[PDB]
Design a protein around this ligand. Structure first.
Ligand SMILES: OC[C@H]1O[C@@H](O)[C@H](O)[C@@H](O)[C@@H]1O
Ligand SMILES: OC[C@H]1O[C@@H](O)[C@H](O)[C@@H](O)[C@@H]1O
Ligand SMILES: [Cl-]
Ligand code: NA
Length: 382
């Protein structure tokens, strides 16, 4: 795929092969209050029952028809999180495997629908970020002990399995390595070099995707600058920062444009906005972790409430008003046009149990998500 010269238009399959509480709360809640991440979920259930419940979800959550709907929506890419444990749980891990059979199907189904797949190693041994979505929330132990070597071992098998397919256009080293949370950048760059070498052992045609580690994406200038070969992944969200979450719709749109002009256009590499969304609040149930509240309504970090989370926590955008859907679409269109100034975009996420603004499958049916660059209800922003 020509990342240097063509626009990525994608969606993530979040919550599928790496489960997250906010994406599928029912599954976590069926295992009780202490099931707060895939680690704890699988530990609580035990191996046999975890395999049963998680495999039921792997099978039901995604079909070929999902991929066809993605292609019908004007997409060309699907980013697919997978955890290291899919390639072999480590000694003592509670995790169960079996995801690879489903990722095999996704590659087939994506190909059939004309889509490329970006495989994303989303969770590393020890946790590269302390997020629930790494598998295990609550400390960063990646880079301790043998965790990096174990990450490369899993990455190698992942690359070996998939990079023979032209459907698999790109592979991401690790999702959201958390530099400000204590991931060492120099060591991260060494892991990035090793990942590049693994990719080139199997298929030098495949692009290597590197997260910016929460640093400004342009700070990565002069590292592995190689045209289409090496693509930066930056994640752009407006509900995890006090300044952004306080904004009205116009200010949100301006901040999207500023981000594109000051950061995306400042990078010496292709840059995908590999996660972004339609929501402007952090109201979705469990978004900040199961058992944590929301900035928006004052129930996180002693933030001062801006509004209530009564409408935006759960459900489907049909529950909202025409004006609320309209503003949501305005924010989405601005992001599409801003992010296509650089190399494109990959929405988070395809499907949820009802998280207003976060669920592309919902937003498409509701007429909120555009289906082409020409599908614009509002003037072009940025
Ligand atoms: O917080 C929203 C989303 O952010 C993403 O970066 C993480 O990579 C996802 O796994 C998470 O659901
Ligand atoms: O990229 C999105 C991520 O941003 C981080 O700053 C937050 O701590 C995470 O909760 C959030 O998922
Ligand atoms: Cl960043
Ligand atoms: Na909530």
């Amino acid at each position: 795929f020509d990342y240097n010269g063509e626009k990525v238009r994608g969606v993530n399959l979040g919550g599928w092969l790496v489960l997250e509480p906010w994406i599928t709360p029912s599954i976590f809640d069926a295992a009780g209050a202490e099931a707060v991440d895939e680690w704890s979920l699988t530990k609580i259930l035990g191996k046999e029952e975890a395999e049963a419940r998680l495999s039921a979800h792997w099978k039901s959550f995604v079909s070929a028809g999902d991929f066809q709907r993605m292609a019908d929506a004007g997409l060309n890419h699907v980013r697919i999180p997978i955890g290291y444990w899919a390639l072999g749980p480590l000694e003592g891990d509670p995790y169960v495997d079996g995801q690879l059979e489903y990722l095999d199907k996704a590659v087939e189904w994506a190909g059939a629908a004309g889509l490329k797949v970006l495989i994303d190693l989303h969770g590393a041994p020890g946790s590269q970020n302390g997020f629930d979505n790494s598998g295990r929330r609550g400390a960063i132990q990646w880079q301790q002990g043998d965790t990096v070597e174990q990450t490369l071992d899993a990455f190698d098998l992942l690359a070996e399995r998939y990079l023979g397919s032209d459907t698999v256009a790109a592979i991401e080293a690790i999702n959201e390595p958390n530099i400000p949370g204590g991931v060492d950048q120099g060591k991260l760059q060494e892991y990035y070099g090793s990942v590049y070498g693994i990719v080139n052992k199997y298929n030098a045609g495949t692009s290597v995707v590197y997260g910016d580690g929460f640093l400004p994406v342009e700070s990565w200038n002069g590292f592995k600058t190689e045209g289409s070969k090496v693509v930066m992944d930056t994640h752009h969200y407006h509900m995890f920062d006090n300044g952004l979450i306080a904004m009205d719709i116009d200010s949100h749109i301006d901040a999207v444009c500023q981000f594109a002009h000051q950061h995306l256009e400042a990078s010496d590499k292709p840059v995908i906005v590999g996660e972004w969304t339609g929501a402007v609040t952090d109201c979705a149930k469990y978004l900040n972790g199961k058992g944590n509240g929301a900035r928006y309504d004052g129930s996180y970090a002693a933030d001062k409430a801006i509004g209530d989370c009564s409408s935006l926590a759960t459900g489907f955008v049909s529950k909202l008003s025409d004006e609320e859907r309209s503003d949501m679409r305005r924010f989405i269109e601005a992001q599409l046009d801003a992010f296509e100034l650089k190399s494109g975009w990959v929405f988070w996420t395809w499907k949820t149990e009802g998280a207003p603004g976060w669920d592309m499958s919902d937003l498409l049916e509701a007429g909120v998500f555009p289906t082409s660059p020409d599908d614009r209800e509002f003037p072009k922003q940025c």
